[PDB]
């Protein structure tokens, strides 16, 4: 709302058909004839409760392609042939780990059983296929 | 000597139905049942 002129912001008031999720529409064609955008008040005071709020939404993609935005937790050393609790790139589990001959195709990162439970994981920094045996 | 050339389906149905029953019980672990994941470690 600052008097330096920050109150340029505006919203689409009229639209032909509902906007899809994560879709965008920049058009300003005339909507009997009306401009399709309308600007908020946002003077040093708007109406009460109509102050400008800044917003950001974080969308977490979870595609199971190689992960690229990780939390600050540092890795441990890696144990084989003992049953161990583990967290690989966010895949929490529990089992006995073993460097495994059932080699993935080079693009693949997890293996799954008949059930969705994962039977193998590619270790994200030694790059070996661990068998997980429950 | 003719028994070598000759009902086993009525017995194999036991082996096949127990196999299919267990396999179906395992496959239902992949089912979400409305949850955001089929694997509890995800939740």
């Amino acid at each position: 709302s600052k008097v330096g002129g920050n109150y340029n912001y505006r919203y689409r008031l009229f639209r032909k058909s509902n906007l899809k999720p994560f879709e965008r529409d920049i058009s300003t064609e005339i909507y009997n004839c009306y401009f399709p955008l309308q600007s908020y008040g946002f003077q040093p005071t708007n109406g009460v409760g109509y102050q400008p709020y800044r917003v950001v939404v974080l969308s977490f993609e979870l595609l199971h392609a190689p992960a690229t935005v990780c939390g600050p937790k540092k890795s441990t050393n890696l144990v084989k042939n003992k049953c161990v609790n583990f967290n690989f790139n966010g895949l929490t589990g529990t089992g006995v780990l073993t460097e495994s001959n059932k080699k993935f195709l080079p693009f693949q990162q997890f293996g799954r059983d008949i059930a969705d439970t994962t039977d193998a994981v590619r270790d994200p920094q030694t790059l070996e296929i661990l068998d997980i045996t429950p | 000597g003719k028994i070598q050339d000759s009902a086993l389906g009525k017995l194999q149905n036991v082996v096949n139905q127990n196999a299919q029953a267990l396999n179906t019980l395992v496959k239902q672990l992949s089912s979400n049942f409305g949850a955001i994941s089929s694997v509890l470690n995800d939740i």
Binding site: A115, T117, P134 | -
Partner: peptide
């Protein structure tokens, strides 16, 4: 497989059923 299913062995082994089946044959003949 690992998901809590387990198949238990029968009490009578296949060899024990063969022994009984042999005993029924031997007796019969």
């Amino acid at each position: 497989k690992f998901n809590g299913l387990t198949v238990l062995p029968p009490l009578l082994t296949d060899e024990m059923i063969a022994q009984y089946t042999s005993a029924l044959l031997a007796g019969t003949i």
